[PDB]
Symmetry: D3
Subunit: 190 residues, 6 copies
Amino acid sequence: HMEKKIVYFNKPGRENTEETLRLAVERAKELGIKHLVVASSYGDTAMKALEMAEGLEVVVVTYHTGFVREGENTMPPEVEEELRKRGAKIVRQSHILSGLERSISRKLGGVSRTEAIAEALRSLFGHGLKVCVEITIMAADSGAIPIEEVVAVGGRSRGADTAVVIRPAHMNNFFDAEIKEIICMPRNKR
Amino acid sequence: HMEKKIVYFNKPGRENTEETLRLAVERAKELGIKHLVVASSYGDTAMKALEMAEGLEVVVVTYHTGFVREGENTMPPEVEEELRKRGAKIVRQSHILSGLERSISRKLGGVSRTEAIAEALRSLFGHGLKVCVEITIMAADSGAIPIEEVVAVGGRSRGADTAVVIRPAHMNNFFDAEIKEIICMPRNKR
Amino acid sequence: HMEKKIVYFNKPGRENTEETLRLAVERAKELGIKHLVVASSYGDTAMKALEMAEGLEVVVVTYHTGFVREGENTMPPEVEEELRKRGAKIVRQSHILSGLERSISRKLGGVSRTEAIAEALRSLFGHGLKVCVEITIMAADSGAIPIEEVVAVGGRSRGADTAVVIRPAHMNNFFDAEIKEIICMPRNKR
Amino acid sequence: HMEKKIVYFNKPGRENTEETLRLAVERAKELGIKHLVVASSYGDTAMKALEMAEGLEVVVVTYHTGFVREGENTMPPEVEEELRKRGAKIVRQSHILSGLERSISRKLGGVSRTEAIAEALRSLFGHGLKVCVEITIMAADSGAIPIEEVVAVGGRSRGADTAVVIRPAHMNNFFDAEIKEIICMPRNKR
Amino acid sequence: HMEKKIVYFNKPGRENTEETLRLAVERAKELGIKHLVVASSYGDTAMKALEMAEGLEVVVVTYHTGFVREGENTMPPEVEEELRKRGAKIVRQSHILSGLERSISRKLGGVSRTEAIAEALRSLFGHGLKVCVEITIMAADSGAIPIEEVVAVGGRSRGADTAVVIRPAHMNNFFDAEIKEIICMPRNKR
Amino acid sequence: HMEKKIVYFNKPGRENTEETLRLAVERAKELGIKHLVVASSYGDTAMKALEMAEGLEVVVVTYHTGFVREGENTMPPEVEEELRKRGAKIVRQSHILSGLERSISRKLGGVSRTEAIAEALRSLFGHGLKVCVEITIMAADSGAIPIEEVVAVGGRSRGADTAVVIRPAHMNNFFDAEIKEIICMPRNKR
Ligand SMILES: Cc1cc2nc3c(=O)[nH]c(=O)nc-3n(C[C@H](O)[C@H](O)[C@H](O)COP(=O)(O)O)c2cc1C
Ligand SMILES: Cc1cc2nc3c(=O)[nH]c(=O)nc-3n(C[C@H](O)[C@H](O)[C@H](O)COP(=O)(O)O)c2cc1C
Ligand SMILES: Cc1cc2nc3c(=O)[nH]c(=O)nc-3n(C[C@H](O)[C@H](O)[C@H](O)COP(=O)(O)O)c2cc1C
Ligand SMILES: Cc1cc2nc3c(=O)[nH]c(=O)nc-3n(C[C@H](O)[C@H](O)[C@H](O)COP(=O)(O)O)c2cc1C
Ligand SMILES: Cc1cc2nc3c(=O)[nH]c(=O)nc-3n(C[C@H](O)[C@H](O)[C@H](O)COP(=O)(O)O)c2cc1C
Ligand SMILES: Cc1cc2nc3c(=O)[nH]c(=O)nc-3n(C[C@H](O)[C@H](O)[C@H](O)COP(=O)(O)O)c2cc1C
């Protein structure tokens, strides 16, 4: 057995961003992990991650085109260009913990099994954990990370509040993904 | 923020039982928690929990009647009688992270949203975490615990390997349940 | 073939309680049945059942804790204590003809297969029949009745209006449950 | 309240056909019901129903074309012609307690809510009751019966073993259908 | 390979009726097809189809009884009588691209797999194509057409705007149905 | 109304690749369409598309990483590099007409609404049409195409056999996608 630190935040959400990234990088370095997978909708957390990465490869997972308005991206080109210049990979694809079922539930009614899994992760462990899982599958399916332990970072709405060590998998073998360690999360999710 | 210990086990399953209970009791006492909710199919973990509880109220959650063979219980009367003599509460009811949908998926085919949630908890966090959640809802619905933070304990197949601090909820408000802290779990679930 | 009496009530609901119990007990005694399984939310029907049981074992199935408000019971302690003094068993657990799917349908939308079965029983045969089935599975899963024919009693909202002879089963073998006889029910369910 | 006869058969299935029809006609006449809705796959029960109808209008509900082999009917033309000559209506359409979902569950896997309702009716009340319900909705949707109480007759595999008094409804208002009385059914469904 | 004409209409709906029928009949005759399957709710398109059929057998598929109001038909008797006099077959049965699931989604919430298929056909190819498919399965299940290529015609709300050459199938082998050719459809569905 | 050519192939599959691309490019140029979205698993169809594009922008949609083996890509780096050199965009992301539901149906059983839509497209219109739709949503979600009419190309297993003019949409507004024209498809899908 391994006794490790876990950090619990008093509140969820964006105030926790810098500490989450610090702890994420700290654990990655202890484990010899190479990839830091970070959710960033508009680019703030991505930029902070690059500043703090200390040599880790940063894989930024952003919103699918059309998440807010069809055909539009939340992260603007000038931000994306700077992230790429600083060596980030950018993953932009469908959100795999809802998928096409979101169109059906929104327009016609009734949620799917996938959406139920998403909501149980949100409720039990917080939105940031749900996102950690979701972005890891997306990064894997998009070919941005290998099937090796990575550190994933997500949050509630904006910024970051949760970091995990996770073994990735794909949309066709989701039950092979595994949370190895929880580095930090809000004690209070809501 | 709160920096706490989390213990990761190298293997899942029954070898971790005594350490899981020790750590569960340790955290409950730090937090002023009164109830220890423990999964025990045949009674072994329940008996160990009572020995180690140091004044906590132990709520034992066992298998539903008929889990293996219709009309039969896995925990035998002599064990149940001893647990009750030592002050345990016993919860015996339907397993709420499958429910009647298990009859449908087994006989007719296709899993439900509830069963999908269960499997995602098993795969991401291990069977013991899934059980921690499940038994907490069952204990709440059966009227054995209040809606206050409790420590829940479960494992892979037999014994215990996972302990959490959890805010309970019921079958009709499941998304109000929340994992506040993870005390210990297997690093490797399988 | 066996020609038997069935009693059809003109209206559903609580006005039928005493006659339903009378007919339930009458049929149980004809068949040599030992257990009378009765739904009672607040305790009225349970108390009447005990008065009328004539030596049958009464198994009272009540609401899950949290059915109305989280952490609260509809049947109050003083009633529960009196029922136990008079020899009733009390079953309090999750309602198995909805289960965790009720949280999903209420919060996120869309009903499950289990909830669809429940509604078809309510519509075709009345709420009291649906309850008869539901409480029999619950009583079985909670270990309160054997897998032998029992008489079950339920109603529309309050009291009783339907009684059946039923072969129990569990949440994992629901399709083995069987209605052997319908003793009484409302001709008009609504 | 109304005290009536119900007849319970010792075995399910085809041996009960003549008695089921006799009892069905008897009850229809007591109630002033005009329509007798009868399941007949190959025509035997339909022919017997016409012989025994004593002035009731017989609505025969048969298998959908393709139930056994695509493009083929189980009831042959010579039988259909004789039934029509004797004044029967013939309903031949999709089986509405499975519908298109049967193609999905058979080819791709997983049963629907509709198929789950069907199976619960089969298990709790027997196949003949399930059929009584199903054929009443089909007869209504096909325009063969009005929305008035009718007597419906069905069975296990062949012949008849169950008769009910039922208020019809359609595929779009199924929960308005109601079983008013159960005239006869097998005590033992299987 | 076969180079053929397809006609795209600028608008969906009833304005396209006469041209759709003309093109449908034209293609049927080129292929030696015998049956023209036409959706007609109130009878207008059916009557026009008979006028234009030039010796094809017209199979009219109308609304299920109760589509608007329980127990009522949209096509009135005087129209049905005239269609039959002119040699049409009339199919009136449950709408198989929703079925009983429509009662569940309307009353209780959440759409089925069948309803999701229907909506995807409506959105991708227009309501008229969805109807072409639906009425072909209905006509097959009702025994009105053989399992041979037919031309099917449907539209948006009223009239016709889409015609296809289709290989029929039944509710239990839906995935054997196949669109061989699209004769005409709206370029703009909405 | 617009009378246009549609080409029907006698057989599905890879033999149709060059003609499908020729017809796709022909129609795009007639309409002033700028983007040709092409499915290519291993790269063959992509390379042919670039050769034949005549100035259109080619958006290649390939398999998700892990489609065959976790962590592996079907299109090898040397092919991807050449496609990029020749000006193709490459979309690699989760397959949105199955998504995470594929893990659930494969491991646990039962298909989703999304998978049912996919299968209905495959059966009615052929695998190549299904792919045309799927890759258009993926290309949109990945930010590779605007919400303007595009020509999409897909096939049965390998190569191409179907081309459409399609208005894209995203995973959250799928029912806004629309097939404007079918350029070519197999008359016989299987
Ligand atoms: C693919 C994706 C899915 C997300 N899902 C959720 C969600 O379910 N709940 C939530 O609160 N935030 C969600 N987020 C937000 C992230 O957790 C994170 O707070 C955000 O991307 C950071 O953006 P910023 O760097 O611009 O602040 C999601 C983000 C992404 C990229
Ligand atoms: C309600 C209930 C559900 C359970 N579900 C699972 C499960 O999903 N997977 C698993 O490996 N063990 C499961 N278990 C087993 C428990 O996690 C634990 O290992 C067991 O109850 C301990 O029994 P013992 O004390 O007799 O060893 C379940 C136990 C209970 C009581
Ligand atoms: C587990 C459970 C489920 C019930 N479900 C329903 C229901 O679906 N519809 C309904 O009208 N009543 C339902 N009831 C109410 C019972 O049928 C019965 O009328 C009630 O429990 C009697 O309570 P009383 O004795 O306090 O009057 C349910 C009761 C229980 C205990
Ligand atoms: C629409 C339809 C559905 C049926 N479904 C079932 C069924 O679920 N189970 C069963 O045992 N028989 C089923 N049957 C059979 C009937 O209950 C009845 O036994 C049969 O139609 C009588 O045919 P016969 O007169 O040729 O003997 C069905 C029949 C029809 C027409
Ligand atoms: C079984 C059936 C299902 C139909 N479903 C739809 C539908 O989904 N959307 C729609 O716009 N029209 C639908 N229609 C309407 C038809 O496509 C067609 O426009 C109509 O039946 C023509 O009726 P009329 O001849 O009285 O104008 C449906 C019609 C039938 C008979
Ligand atoms: C995202 C994606 C999904 C696909 N789904 C299917 C499918 O459902 N059925 C099928 O026969 N082919 C499917 N294909 C194969 C394509 O239609 C096409 O034949 C193939 O990608 C061409 O690869 P090649 O250029 O290496 O021959 C799919 C391809 C992709 C990229």
